[PDB]
Design an enzyme around this catalytic site. Structure first.
Site, PDB file in Angstrom:
ATOM      1  N   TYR A   1      -6.503 -99.920  23.964  1.00 10.34           N
ATOM      2  CA  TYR A   1      -5.748-100.580  25.031  1.00 10.34           C
ATOM      3  C   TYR A   1      -6.472-100.480  26.372  1.00 10.34           C
ATOM      4  O   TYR A   1      -6.889 -99.326  26.624  1.00 10.34           O
ATOM      5  CB  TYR A   1      -4.344 -99.998  25.166  1.00 10.34           C
ATOM      6  CG  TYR A   1      -3.514-100.652  26.254  1.00 10.34           C
ATOM      7  CD1 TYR A   1      -2.677-101.698  25.881  1.00 10.34           C
ATOM      8  CD2 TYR A   1      -3.526-100.265  27.585  1.00 10.34           C
ATOM      9  CE1 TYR A   1      -1.886-102.354  26.809  1.00 10.34           C
ATOM     10  CE2 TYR A   1      -2.718-100.899  28.515  1.00 10.34           C
ATOM     11  CZ  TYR A   1      -1.898-101.939  28.126  1.00 10.34           C
ATOM     12  OH  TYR A   1      -1.078-102.610  29.011  1.00 10.34           O
TER      13      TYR A   1
ATOM     14  N   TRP B   1      -7.336-102.498  30.638  1.00 12.35           N
ATOM     15  CA  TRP B   1      -7.506-103.562  31.607  1.00 12.35           C
ATOM     16  C   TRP B   1      -8.921-104.067  31.793  1.00 12.35           C
ATOM     17  O   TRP B   1      -9.049-105.171  32.338  1.00 12.35           O
ATOM     18  CB  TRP B   1      -6.915-103.143  32.981  1.00 12.35           C
ATOM     19  CG  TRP B   1      -5.550-103.776  33.076  1.00 12.35           C
ATOM     20  CD1 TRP B   1      -4.435-103.427  32.347  1.00 12.35           C
ATOM     21  CD2 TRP B   1      -5.202-104.906  33.885  1.00 12.35           C
ATOM     22  NE1 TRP B   1      -3.408-104.309  32.663  1.00 12.35           N
ATOM     23  CE2 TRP B   1      -3.859-105.215  33.606  1.00 12.35           C
ATOM     24  CE3 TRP B   1      -5.897-105.707  34.791  1.00 12.35           C
ATOM     25  CZ2 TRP B   1      -3.186-106.247  34.237  1.00 12.35           C
ATOM     26  CZ3 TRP B   1      -5.238-106.764  35.407  1.00 12.35           C
ATOM     27  CH2 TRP B   1      -3.892-107.021  35.131  1.00 12.35           C
TER      28      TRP B   1
HETATM   29  N1  LIG Z   1       3.156 -92.720  34.425  1.00 15.47           N
HETATM   30  C1  LIG Z   1       2.719 -94.075  34.348  1.00 15.47           C
HETATM   31  N2  LIG Z   1       3.268 -95.024  35.140  1.00 15.47           N
HETATM   32  C2  LIG Z   1       2.868 -96.311  35.091  1.00 15.47           C
HETATM   33  O1  LIG Z   1       3.480 -97.110  35.801  1.00 15.47           O
HETATM   34  C3  LIG Z   1       1.841 -96.646  34.221  1.00 15.47           C
HETATM   35  N3  LIG Z   1       1.259 -97.955  34.024  1.00 15.47           N
HETATM   36  C4  LIG Z   1       0.914 -98.294  32.626  1.00 15.47           C
HETATM   37  C5  LIG Z   1       0.424 -99.713  32.558  1.00 15.47           C
HETATM   38  S1  LIG Z   1       1.575-101.012  33.060  1.00 15.47           S
HETATM   39  C6  LIG Z   1      -0.860 -99.944  32.189  1.00 15.47           C
HETATM   40  S2  LIG Z   1      -1.380-101.688  32.116  1.00 15.47           S
HETATM   41  C7  LIG Z   1      -1.819 -98.804  31.894  1.00 15.47           C
HETATM   42  C8  LIG Z   1      -3.266 -99.120  32.368  1.00 15.47           C
HETATM   43  O2  LIG Z   1      -4.109 -98.184  31.711  1.00 15.47           O
HETATM   44  P1  LIG Z   1      -5.730 -98.799  31.541  1.00 15.47           P
HETATM   45  O3  LIG Z   1      -6.556 -97.746  30.434  1.00 15.47           O
HETATM   46  O4  LIG Z   1      -5.830-100.416  31.202  1.00 15.47           O
HETATM   47  O5  LIG Z   1      -6.339 -98.468  33.025  1.00 15.47           O
HETATM   48  P2  LIG Z   1      -7.740 -98.792  33.807  1.00 15.47           P
HETATM   49  O6  LIG Z   1      -7.927 -97.604  34.984  1.00 15.47           O
HETATM   50  O7  LIG Z   1      -7.711-100.400  34.309  1.00 15.47           O
HETATM   51  O8  LIG Z   1      -8.906 -98.553  32.522  1.00 15.47           O
HETATM   52  C9  LIG Z   1      -9.826 -99.591  32.450  1.00 15.47           C
HETATM   53  C10 LIG Z   1     -11.195 -98.931  32.164  1.00 15.47           C
HETATM   54  O9  LIG Z   1     -12.061 -99.967  31.698  1.00 15.47           O
HETATM   55  C11 LIG Z   1     -13.329 -99.736  32.289  1.00 15.47           C
HETATM   56  N4  LIG Z   1     -14.047-101.021  32.222  1.00 15.47           N
HETATM   57  C12 LIG Z   1     -13.895-102.131  33.015  1.00 15.47           C
HETATM   58  N5  LIG Z   1     -14.680-103.154  32.592  1.00 15.47           N
HETATM   59  C13 LIG Z   1     -15.364-102.643  31.533  1.00 15.47           C
HETATM   60  C14 LIG Z   1     -16.321-103.224  30.704  1.00 15.47           C
HETATM   61  O10 LIG Z   1     -16.727-104.365  30.842  1.00 15.47           O
HETATM   62  N6  LIG Z   1     -16.838-102.498  29.658  1.00 15.47           N
HETATM   63  C15 LIG Z   1     -16.395-101.207  29.453  1.00 15.47           C
HETATM   64  N7  LIG Z   1     -16.938-100.533  28.351  1.00 15.47           N
HETATM   65  N8  LIG Z   1     -15.446-100.635  30.276  1.00 15.47           N
HETATM   66  C16 LIG Z   1     -14.956-101.379  31.299  1.00 15.47           C
HETATM   67  C17 LIG Z   1     -12.973 -99.288  33.691  1.00 15.47           C
HETATM   68  O11 LIG Z   1     -14.070 -98.705  34.294  1.00 15.47           O
HETATM   69  C18 LIG Z   1     -11.776 -98.362  33.433  1.00 15.47           C
HETATM   70  O12 LIG Z   1     -12.186 -97.039  33.269  1.00 15.47           O
HETATM   71  O13 LIG Z   1      -1.448 -97.559  32.463  1.00 15.47           O
HETATM   72  C19 LIG Z   1      -0.104 -97.293  32.063  1.00 15.47           C
HETATM   73  N9  LIG Z   1       0.244 -95.938  32.492  1.00 15.47           N
HETATM   74  C20 LIG Z   1       1.269 -95.635  33.429  1.00 15.47           C
HETATM   75  N10 LIG Z   1       1.719 -94.361  33.499  1.00 15.47           N
HETATM   76  N1  LIG Z   2      -2.617-102.614  43.518  1.00 13.13           N
HETATM   77  C1  LIG Z   2      -2.289-102.712  42.135  1.00 13.13           C
HETATM   78  N2  LIG Z   2      -2.627-101.718  41.281  1.00 13.13           N
HETATM   79  C2  LIG Z   2      -2.338-101.682  39.964  1.00 13.13           C
HETATM   80  O1  LIG Z   2      -2.676-100.690  39.271  1.00 13.13           O
HETATM   81  C3  LIG Z   2      -1.656-102.809  39.478  1.00 13.13           C
HETATM   82  N3  LIG Z   2      -1.274-102.888  38.091  1.00 13.13           N
HETATM   83  C4  LIG Z   2      -0.916-104.241  37.598  1.00 13.13           C
HETATM   84  C5  LIG Z   2      -0.127-104.021  36.338  1.00 13.13           C
HETATM   85  S1  LIG Z   2      -1.107-103.704  34.862  1.00 13.13           S
HETATM   86  C6  LIG Z   2       1.216-104.235  36.283  1.00 13.13           C
HETATM   87  S2  LIG Z   2       2.069-103.821  34.753  1.00 13.13           S
HETATM   88  C7  LIG Z   2       1.978-104.456  37.572  1.00 13.13           C
HETATM   89  C8  LIG Z   2       3.077-103.357  37.793  1.00 13.13           C
HETATM   90  O2  LIG Z   2       4.079-104.092  38.471  1.00 13.13           O
HETATM   91  P1  LIG Z   2       5.453-103.038  38.618  1.00 13.13           P
HETATM   92  O3  LIG Z   2       6.690-103.970  39.301  1.00 13.13           O
HETATM   93  O4  LIG Z   2       5.766-102.297  37.141  1.00 13.13           O
HETATM   94  O5  LIG Z   2       4.932-101.911  39.688  1.00 13.13           O
HETATM   95  P2  LIG Z   2       5.326-100.375  40.054  1.00 13.13           P
HETATM   96  O6  LIG Z   2       4.305 -99.998  41.358  1.00 13.13           O
HETATM   97  O7  LIG Z   2       5.226 -99.463  38.647  1.00 13.13           O
HETATM   98  O8  LIG Z   2       6.973-100.449  40.608  1.00 13.13           O
HETATM   99  C9  LIG Z   2       7.258-101.422  41.565  1.00 13.13           C
HETATM  100  C10 LIG Z   2       8.324-100.712  42.434  1.00 13.13           C
HETATM  101  O9  LIG Z   2       9.347-100.163  41.604  1.00 13.13           O
HETATM  102  C11 LIG Z   2       9.892 -99.101  42.405  1.00 13.13           C
HETATM  103  N4  LIG Z   2      10.700 -98.285  41.479  1.00 13.13           N
HETATM  104  C12 LIG Z   2      10.321 -97.235  40.706  1.00 13.13           C
HETATM  105  N5  LIG Z   2      11.385 -96.763  40.003  1.00 13.13           N
HETATM  106  C13 LIG Z   2      12.433 -97.548  40.309  1.00 13.13           C
HETATM  107  C14 LIG Z   2      13.747 -97.562  39.877  1.00 13.13           C
HETATM  108  O10 LIG Z   2      14.287 -96.815  39.037  1.00 13.13           O
HETATM  109  N6  LIG Z   2      14.552 -98.553  40.412  1.00 13.13           N
HETATM  110  C15 LIG Z   2      14.103 -99.444  41.328  1.00 13.13           C
HETATM  111  N7  LIG Z   2      15.001-100.407  41.866  1.00 13.13           N
HETATM  112  N8  LIG Z   2      12.810 -99.416  41.786  1.00 13.13           N
HETATM  113  C16 LIG Z   2      11.994 -98.476  41.194  1.00 13.13           C
HETATM  114  C17 LIG Z   2       8.634 -98.381  42.900  1.00 13.13           C
HETATM  115  O11 LIG Z   2       8.978 -97.615  44.026  1.00 13.13           O
HETATM  116  C18 LIG Z   2       7.713 -99.536  43.183  1.00 13.13           C
HETATM  117  O12 LIG Z   2       7.640 -99.797  44.551  1.00 13.13           O
HETATM  118  O13 LIG Z   2       1.199-104.417  38.723  1.00 13.13           O
HETATM  119  C19 LIG Z   2      -0.045-105.044  38.569  1.00 13.13           C
HETATM  120  N9  LIG Z   2      -0.650-105.010  39.910  1.00 13.13           N
HETATM  121  C20 LIG Z   2      -1.315-103.839  40.341  1.00 13.13           C
HETATM  122  N10 LIG Z   2      -1.633-103.810  41.680  1.00 13.13           N
HETATM  123 MO   LIG Z   3       0.420-103.122  33.052  1.00 11.16          MO
END
Ligand SMILES: NC1=NC(=O)C2=N[C@H]3C(S)=C(S)[C@@H](COP(=O)(O)OP(=O)(O)OC[C@H]4O[C@@H](n5cnc6c(=O)[nH]c(N)nc65)[C@H](O)[C@@H]4O)O[C@H]3NC2=N1
Ligand SMILES: NC1=NC(=O)C2=N[C@H]3C(S)=C(S)[C@@H](COP(=O)(O)OP(=O)(O)OC[C@H]4O[C@@H](n5cnc6c(=O)[nH]c(N)nc65)[C@H](O)[C@@H]4O)O[C@H]3NC2=N1
Ligand SMILES: [Mo+6]
Length: 765
Positions: free
Chosen positions: A111, A113
């Site tokens: 999994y 990004w």
């Molecule tokens: N507690 C918690 N709260 C959250 O809200 C939360 N968010 C979740 C969500 S919504 C997501 S989407 C996940 C994201 O977790 P995800 O593992 O997708 O996070 P990234 O830091 O984007 O990891 C991408 C890695 O790919 C590497 N990379 C980029 N391009 C390349 C390439 O071309 N080749 C290779 N080999 N590597 C590359 C980057 O350097 C980076 O280390 O975290 C999840 N985890 C979360 N935990």
């Molecule tokens: N700058 C940036 N960095 C990233 O890593 C990034 N990740 C991308 C990805 S993979 C996704 S999935 C999306 C995530 O988009 P998502 O909407 O899941 O983003 P979060 O920052 O996890 O939460 C948004 C808001 O929810 C509020 N919040 C947390 N808990 C609660 C709750 O119980 N109730 C309510 N009402 N609010 C709550 C937090 O305070 C936060 O401001 O963003 C995308 N865009 C992203 N932008």
């Molecule tokens: Mo996501």
């Protein structure tokens, strides 16, 4: 090489300045209406101290292989090897696992990004190699909308979370009240899955210019609140479903809701109403009952319900509230409330689950789709159950109505992902990884995941190769040439080149490359898009003229008038939804038949594992473990941007002045954040931007264990997933619950700590 070159990334289109073969600046595309300041760190990631220089093999694995002591993974004791040695070893290990255990012994969900790009799509390339080697176990879904993407097809008959929204300009002309429910669009619109156009920024500015009433419902006073000077509601985290039920209850008790919309466009409201009124459980879900759980004043809940019923209102929800225990309930209850308001499919009204993500709502053009390399094709698990799978081989699990058995996996191969940062409950996961015989990782930065591999292969970034990609996940603004800016650094190689060599050693080289090289693949994707465009009346140039200009942009025809659900609203018998009834299912007969205790057949308030002020909850503070402002997840943590937010070198923790004062904590102190799952260090920033009872520690910090051989070791930097629980949202989606976290905070009084995550391992220097 002294000049400029245009290319793109998850942060946007840009032009690089190159001076004597080195990139020295990245300047935003002149047509980007709102560039991200993170571009500075993207350029820094090519060169930083954590750039991966060479192929490495963990010393223990190099010497003993399957008999290695796996308890030392992540201690940094690596040995530099040549590419030929490393490629032979990886091919030998894939062959051995496939031959000994079958395809079920190889996990290739990987999994992550990664980076945009139709050719250099590392995770698709991985699966193309693994298919040629005999097959693999894949993952299903994502960590992003783990629950929402599974419950929406049952409610509205479509995926919904990744589909186009009512257009921004339609909202500016018709919306009177705009609600950001658990969404911070100013923060999360900086990036795109494909190259972003940052279309939310002019869309948000237009609402502000029109004087539209904006309400934000979030525990933190975010930049979205500040941008609009919005009315700000602060619910205790994880109580949004109770608030929605108290709003729904008010609409019934005051006789205000749209009875005709409910009768004409929905199914099962009559089975939900008794629950809402408390006939089945003696507990009317009143505004007062909702205040008791959420802390939001009952009169405020009734006035918002009243306001929303009387004005054209758009409920723009984000995804933090579905990344939690019982996460499916949040957007199901949101759709149920919007159906009672009766504005779904009206210009400016209803709901939207993507206004804060990848430009949702940015008017779509009439341009063609662009596709790229493909993978050439239980065998699949919900992505978040990867540790449960490793600990329970052969055990049964439930998922969306079907029961299957976990495969018995011996190898994991990860590229473009960082599970040693993104996955929940780090201490449990570290122990479960000892079940794997072999772990192979490709990355270009020394993340915690690369530090924990048995074999580490240095990938290139997109800036060291050519590629092609769409600009605009929803807008389809145009197609960009992602041109090579600098030559590959040190011994780094593209994932494509690495997997073609591994495939070649497995006797499947020609099949992997398909006889093409980098530009032969890119031209094939371009020509397919051009053929489709010509057939649609959107003429595009020939490939070499396209490449020379570097971009093709497409025209908007009627995309700025799009209203989501308008055809269903206008005639539901002619344009029914994809559900069994053809209507919005507030009660689902299909979910009822699953008999899942944690996912009932209508939206229900259920107690989560732990919540702020829950009866008997052990720990006092909720951790808003949300998406980082100045990283893309863990991406860019090892760059110059880190010094703009770190506190005494650690990941920052926002804490309310009252909670700090009760613990004798001063602004800037190093503090320990801990619960029964783990313990981490963060640097505190005292500020009333977080509501009392809540602390904010973004996800993505690079886990930096004090001693990997010590169970429950302190993380020195601040990876918030050392504190999360690893449980499914429910049996419906089995989504991750990374934001269902309570903990305690104290001024740190243990041994001093040296951060080692932002320099390479000694042998890789
Ligand atoms: N507690 C918690 N709260 C959250 O809200 C939360 N968010 C979740 C969500 S919504 C997501 S989407 C996940 C994201 O977790 P995800 O593992 O997708 O996070 P990234 O830091 O984007 O990891 C991408 C890695 O790919 C590497 N990379 C980029 N391009 C390349 C390439 O071309 N080749 C290779 N080999 N590597 C590359 C980057 O350097 C980076 O280390 O975290 C999840 N985890 C979360 N935990
Ligand atoms: N700058 C940036 N960095 C990233 O890593 C990034 N990740 C991308 C990805 S993979 C996704 S999935 C999306 C995530 O988009 P998502 O909407 O899941 O983003 P979060 O920052 O996890 O939460 C948004 C808001 O929810 C509020 N919040 C947390 N808990 C609660 C709750 O119980 N109730 C309510 N009402 N609010 C709550 C937090 O305070 C936060 O401001 O963003 C995308 N865009 C992203 N932008
Ligand atoms: Mo996501």
């Amino acid at each position: 090489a002294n000049g400029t070159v245009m290319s793109g990334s998850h942060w946007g289109v840009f032009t690089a300045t190159v001076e004597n073969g080195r990139a020295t600046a990245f300047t935003p595309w002149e047509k980007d209406p709102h560039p991200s300041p993170m571009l500075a760190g993207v350029l820094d990631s090519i060169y930083s101290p954590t750039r991966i220089k060479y192929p490495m093999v963990r010393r223990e694995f190099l010497e003993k292989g399957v008999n290695a002591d796996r308890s030392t993974r992540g201690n940094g004791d690596f040995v530099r090897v040549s590419w030929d040695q490393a490629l032979d070893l990886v091919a030998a290990e894939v062959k051995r696992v496939e031959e000994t255990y079958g395809p079920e012994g190889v996990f290739g969900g990987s999994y992550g990004w990664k980076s945009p790009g139709r050719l250099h799509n590392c995770t698709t390339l991985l699966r193309r190699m693994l298919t040629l080697a005999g097959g693999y176990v894949n993952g299903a879904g994502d960590y992003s909308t783990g629950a929402a993407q599974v419950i929406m097809p049952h409610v509205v008959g479509t995926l919904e979370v990744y589909e186009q929204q009512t257009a921004w300009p339609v909202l500016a002309e018709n919306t009177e009240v705009m609600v950001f429910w658990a969404a911070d669009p100013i923060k999360t619109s900086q990036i795109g899955w494909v190259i972003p156009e940052h279309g939310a920024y002019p869309g948000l500015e237009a609402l502000k210019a029109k004087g539209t009433k904006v309400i934000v419902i979030d525990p933190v006073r975010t930049k979205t609140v500040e941008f609009f000077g919005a009315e700000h509601i602060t619910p205790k985290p994880q109580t949004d479903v109770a608030i929605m039920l108290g709003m729904a209850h008010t609409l019934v008790a005051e006789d205000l809701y749209d009875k005709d919309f409910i009768a004409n466009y929905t199914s099962g409201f009559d089975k939900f109403l008794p629950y809402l009124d408390g006939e089945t459980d003696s507990t009317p879900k009143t505004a007062e009952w909702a205040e008791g759980i959420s802390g939001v004043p009952a009169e405020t809940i009734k006035e918002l319900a009243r306001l929303f019923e009387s004005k054209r209102t758009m409920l723009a929800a984000g995804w933090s509230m579905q990344r939690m225990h019982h996460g499916e309930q949040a957007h199901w209850m949101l759709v149920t409330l919007a159906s009672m308001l009766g504005q779904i499919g009206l210009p400016g009204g209803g709901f939207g689950l993507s206004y804060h993500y990848s430009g949702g709502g940015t008017p779509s053009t009439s341009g063609p789709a662009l596709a790229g390399i493909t993978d050439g094709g239980a065998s699949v698990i919900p992505v978040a159950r990867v540790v449960d799978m490793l600990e329970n081989p052969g055990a049964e699990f439930d998922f969306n109505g079907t029961r299957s058995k976990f495969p018995d996996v011996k190898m994991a191969y990860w590229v473009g992902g960082n599970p040693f940062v993104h996955h929940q409950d780090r201490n449990r996961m570290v122990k479960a990884w000892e079940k794997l015989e072999t772990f192979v990782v490709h990355d270009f930065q020394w993340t915690p995941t690369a530090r924990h591999a048995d074999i580490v292969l240095p990938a290139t970034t997109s800036y060291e190769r050519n590629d092609i990609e769409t600009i605009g996940d929803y807008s389809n603004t145009g197609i960009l040439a992602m041109k090579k800016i600098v030559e590959p650094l040190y011994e780094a190689r593209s994932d494509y080149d690495i997997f073609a060599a591994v495939a070649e050693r497995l006797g499947k080289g020609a099949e992997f490359t398909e006889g093409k090289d980098e530009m032969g693949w890119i031209k094939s994707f371009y020509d397919d898009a051009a053929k489709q465009g010509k057939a649609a009346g959107v003429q595009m140039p020939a490939f070499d003229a396209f490449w020379a200009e570097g971009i093709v942009e497409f025209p908007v025809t009627d995309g700025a008038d799009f209203v989501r659900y308008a055809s269903f609203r206008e005639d539901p018998l002619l344009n029914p939804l994809g559900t069994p009834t053809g209507l919005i299912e507030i009660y689902s007969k299909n979910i009822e038949k699953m008999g899942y205790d944690d996912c009932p057949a209508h939206p229900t308030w259920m107690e989560p594992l732990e919540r702020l002020d829950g009866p008997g909850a052990k720990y006092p503070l909720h951790i808003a473990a949300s998406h980082p402002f100045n990283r893309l997840h863990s991406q860019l943590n090892g760059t110059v941007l880190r010094e703009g937010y770190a506190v005494q070198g650690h990941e920052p923790c926002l804490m309310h002045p009252d909670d700090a004062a009760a613990r004798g904590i001063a602004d800037g102190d190093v503090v320990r954040v801990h619960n029964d799952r783990g313990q981490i260090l963060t640097g505190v920033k005292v500020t009333d931007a977080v509501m009392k009872g809540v602390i904010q520690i973004y996800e993505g910090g690079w886990y930096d264990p004090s001693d990997v051989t010590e169970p429950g070791t302190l993380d020195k930097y601040g990876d918030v997933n050392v504190l999360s629980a690893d449980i499914g949202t429910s049996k419906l989606a089995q989504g991750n619950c990374g934001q269902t976290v309570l903990a305690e905070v104290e001024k740190y009084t243990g041994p001093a700590v040296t951060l080692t995550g932002f320099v390479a391992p000694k042998a890789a220097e």
